[PDB]
Ligand binder design. Structure first.
Ligand SMILES: CCCCCCCCCCCC(=O)OC[C@H](COP(=O)(O)OCC[N+](C)(C)C)OC(=O)CCCCCCCCCCC
Ligand SMILES: CCCCCCCCCO[C@@H]1O[C@H](CO)[C@@H](O)[C@H](O)[C@H]1O
Ligand SMILES: [Ca+2]
Lengths: 449, 85
């Protein structure tokens, strides 16, 4: 059952668009008149008011779009509109680091309707974004390599159509938590998959099952690089009780959204944050997440850790294989950037039972004490742990050690650290030494060695 | 977390609710929600009677150095910086 439109072509409910296990219902895209896609242009010139544009020379000509800079299209998902503040705020962040044509794609006439129909309307949106990219190339000789399509959830698959239709020539697509229902498990046609663009990178933040767990994003790997922050299933900050979740640090709206879809919306908050933290979301290649937390995937390889987000395209190995998984950890609330360190403590003093904590000191800053070990503290054993500092402390100048236990032992024992070694995510190792042991709750400074 | 063992960011009426024993808020009529104990070289308040902080107290081994003695600051503004002793 085909449905053809002028400029966009025909749409048919044939397999695999309908009638597969994953997509039973035979539904067609609406529209084009109804979905009603609009390109709301924001540029460094006009950072605050978009100017609506279209695929015709008098619109591109009459606006701040410059063919001399890159074009980053942001596509939203189910239920949003392109006027939602997170699309404008990816732009507001992009302008701090570049001259870019930021086109927010609004398709709310097709997104505020039943999910099964919003999954099909995607097709008109991808068709609509392709035509504008085709037209920048025909009219203004602007190569698809300059185009980046950032699409969140159902918008990630919209991006995947855009690239499919320009087959593979667009620069990159960034699928931010691609929607799982009606896509996970289906062929490359019907979804975002590494072939729809020259580079595809994904951020996975809700990889749980839609039923039973109401995990909106997908767990499957659809990009050259697929990043799984906090292991991609459950995000820090998202398990806050409904009243402090809705009542947010500003926004009943941003609160309500996170009550409804926290994890799933965390993907564009990490991306938005990466723009201005260019080293702050390093990606550790690992067999899994459980291994990464087993302290077995650090540091980065001589090669590098890709940055999750806006600078993943700076990763040298980026298109070397499809579906490469990177694990990493972020913050619970904004400024999600974290800097993982590894620390090995070699103990001295009396065998006691405690917690040992470390603090790092470097030229750029210092840190929270992190816990490296809690257990039998036997002298001469070593104990390492990796941890996501919230501060990149620079080059290490000092490290201070402190322990405490739960039960007061009147023998009054003293424990210390003869050698602590901090290793950075690149592998820089800094060694520190001290011959002193200290009491419970006293802070042992260790100096360079 | 629900009404005790509150995670940082959970709305808070008294610091013992919070896992970090620190309920804090920027200003006076501000919603109080669980936060950090302060680290070395960040501002801090000394432990108070009042229940929620404007500046959390320090990590262990650390001393919030400022002028405590003052009744008045021993009310809500007993602030300091976390020094190791
Ligand atoms: C149970 C089966 C449902 C099937 C659909 C599941 C989603 C799968 C694809 C991912 C969705 C996507 O593309 O990202 C789109 C996201 C998430 O929408 P959602 O994930 O559907 O959340 C499900 C709940 N809703 C349907 C209500 C969204 O935008 C959002 O901020 C959703 C925020 C809506 C906030 C509720 C506000 C109420 C009004 C304002 C009060 C002042
Ligand atoms: C399922 C959720 C409901 C769908 C339609 C929106 C409900 C009303 C929400 O408003 O408001 C914000 C600031 O006041 C705006 O910035 C934002 O764009 C709006 O939107
Ligand atoms: Ca595809």
């Amino acid at each position: 059952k085909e449905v053809c439109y002028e400029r966009l072509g025909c749409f048919s409910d044939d397999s695999p668009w309908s009638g597969i296990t994953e997509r039973p219902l035979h539904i067609l895209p609406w529209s084009p008149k109804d979905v009603n896609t609009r390109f709301l242009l924001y540029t460094n010139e006009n950072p605050n008011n978009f100017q609506e544009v279209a695929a015709d020379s008098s619109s591109i000509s009459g606006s701040n779009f410059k063919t001399n800079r890159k074009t980053r299209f942001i596509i939203h998902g189910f239920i949003d509109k392109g006027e939602e503040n997170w699309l404008a705020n990816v732009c507001k962040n992009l302008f701090k680091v570049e001259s870019v044509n930021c086109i927010c794609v609004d398709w709310k006439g097709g997104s505020r309707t039943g999910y099964t129909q919003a999954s099909q309307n995607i097709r008109i949106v991808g068709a609509e974004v392709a035509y504008f990219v085709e037209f920048l190339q025909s009219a203004f000789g602007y190569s698809p390599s300059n185009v980046h399509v950032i699409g969140h959830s159902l918008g990630a698959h919209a991006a995947g159509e855009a690239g499919r239709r320009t087959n593979g020539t667009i620069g990159r697509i960034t699928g931010l938590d691609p929607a799982e229902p009606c896509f996970q498990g289906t062929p490359e046609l019907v979804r975002l998959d590494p072939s729809d663009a020259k580079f595809v990178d994904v951020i996975h933040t809700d990889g749980a099952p839609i039923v039973p767990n109401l995990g909106f994003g997908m767990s499957q790997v659809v990009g050259h690089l697929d990043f799984f922050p906090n292991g991609g299933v459950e995000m820090p900050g998202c398990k806050k009780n409904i009243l402090s979740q809705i009542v947010d640090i500003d926004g009943i709206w941003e609160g309500t959204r996170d009550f409804a879809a926290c994890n799933h919306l965390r993907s564009y908050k990490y991306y938005t944050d990466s723009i201005v933290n260019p080293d702050g979301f390093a990606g550790f290649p690992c067999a899994s997440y459980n291994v990464f937390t087993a302290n077995k995937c650090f540091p980065c390889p001589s090669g590098g850790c890709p940055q999750m987000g806006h600078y993943a395209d700076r990763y040298p190995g980026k298109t070397n294989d499809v579906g490469q998984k990177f694990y990493l950890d972020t913050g619970d609330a904004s400024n999600f950037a974290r800097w993982r360190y590894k620390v090995s403590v070699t103990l001295s003093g009396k065998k006691v039972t405690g917690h040992i904590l470390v603090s790092l000191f470097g030229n750029k800053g210092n840190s929270k004490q992190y816990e490296i070990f809690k257990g039998t503290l036997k002298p001469d054993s070593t104990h390492s742990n990796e941890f996501d500092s919230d501060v990149d402390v620079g080059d290490l100048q000092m490290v201070k050690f402190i322990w405490y236990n739960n039960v007061i032992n009147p023998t009054l024992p003293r424990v210390g650290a003869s050698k602590i070694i901090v290793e950075t995510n690149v592998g820089k190792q800094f060694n520190f030494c001290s011959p002193e042991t200290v009491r419970e709750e006293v802070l042992l400074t260790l100096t360079p060695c | 977390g629900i009404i005790i063992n509150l995670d940082e960011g959970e709305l808070c009426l008294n610091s013992a609710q919070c896992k970090s024993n620190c309920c804090q808020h920027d200003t006076i009529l501000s919603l109080l929600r669980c936060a950090l104990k302060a680290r070395e070289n960040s501002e801090c308040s000394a432990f108070t009677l009042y229940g929620v902080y404007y500046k959390c107290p320090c990590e262990r081994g650390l001393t919030c150095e400022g002028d405590k003695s003052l009744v008045g600051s021993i009310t809500n503004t007993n602030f300091g910086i976390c020094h190791n002793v």
